[PDB]
Design a protein around this ligand. Structure first.
Ligand SMILES: Cc1cc(O)cc2c1C(=O)CO2
Length: 112
């Protein structure tokens, strides 16, 4: 496929995923100065701003690599936070609502 339409699709998909994060709790990196023990548990932090930078740096050339980093946003949050927290539930909700966005977007990628 052609790179330009694929990146346009990823930009739109990333915007749709960010729309499901209504609190914007995943918009920027987990602030390591405010969460000092975060890297003790989390091997690869991820967030939507970093994803946008990766997208524009041409680091997502297939849908799976894009989806892998989205999945890191979710899985890091499920790992770090206790189940009874808003953060944990927000990641579950993002997993659910984002899964539908990703399935539709991947179908569009496959038609390229
Ligand atoms: C996602 C997230 C955002 C933030 O601003 C602070 C955080 C988390 C955690 O997962 C724990 O601390």
């Amino acid at each position: 496929m052609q790179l330009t339409p694929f990146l346009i699709l990823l930009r739109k998909t990333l915007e749709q995923l960010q729309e499901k994060d209504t609190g914007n709790i995943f918009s920027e990196p987990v602030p390591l100065s405010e969460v000092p023990d975060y890297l003790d548990h989390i091997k690869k932090p991820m967030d939507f701003f970093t994803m946008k930078q990766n997208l524009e740096a041409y680091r997502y050339l297939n849908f799976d690599d894009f989806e892998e980093d989205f999945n890191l946003i979710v899985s890091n949050c499920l790992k770090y936070n206790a189940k009874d927290t808003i953060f944990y539930r927000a990641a579950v909700r993002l997993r659910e609502q984002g899964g539908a966005v990703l399935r539709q977007a991947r179908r569009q990628a496959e038609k390229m």
